[PDB]
Amino acid sequence: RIGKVTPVELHDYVQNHFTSARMALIGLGVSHPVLKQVAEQFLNIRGGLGLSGAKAKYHGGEIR
Amino acid sequence: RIGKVTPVELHDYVQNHFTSARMALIGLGVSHPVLKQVAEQFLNIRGGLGLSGAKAKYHGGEIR
Numbered sequence: 001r002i003g004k005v006t007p008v009e010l011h012d013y014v015q016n017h018f019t020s021a022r023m024a025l026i027g028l029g030v031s032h033p034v035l036k037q038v039a040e041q042f043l044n045i046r047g048g049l050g051l052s053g054a055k056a057k058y059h060g061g062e063i064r
Numbered sequence: 065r066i067g068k069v070t071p072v073e074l075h076d077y078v079q080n081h082f083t084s085a086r087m088a089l090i091g092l093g094v095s096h097p098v099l100k101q102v103a104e105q106f107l108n109i110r111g112g113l114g115l116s117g118a119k120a121k122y123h124g125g126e127i128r
Binding site: 062 | 125126
């Protein structure tokens with residue numbers, strides 16, 4: 001996949017994972033009204049995926 | 065192992081696998097007395113390993 005990952009794939013990855021319900025803004029040395037302000041102004045993004053993805057199915061096995 | 069297999073390793077591989085009891089000389093368009101002659105002259109080599117190696121142990125599994 002090196003040299004094969006496309007601009008569209010990155011666009012699609014951001015559009016459907018970098019959304020409000022999947023995000024958290026953490027601040028240190030910043031006031032809450034400021035962090036709340038920027039989140040309400042610039043971080044209100046919808047239209048992605050929902051839950052914590054497809055439930056990770058455990059299988060087991062060995063790689064050598 | 066590419067670039068790592070040594071002259072000694074090849075010497076050891078031949079000395080203990082290229083022996084009489086592990087060998088067969090097959091001829092086509094040659095007379096048997098001639099093939100028997102060369103085998104008795106040049107192919108009488110001992111001091112290798114014995115049986116068909118360590119008995120191949122079946123395990124199972126999957127490579128992806």
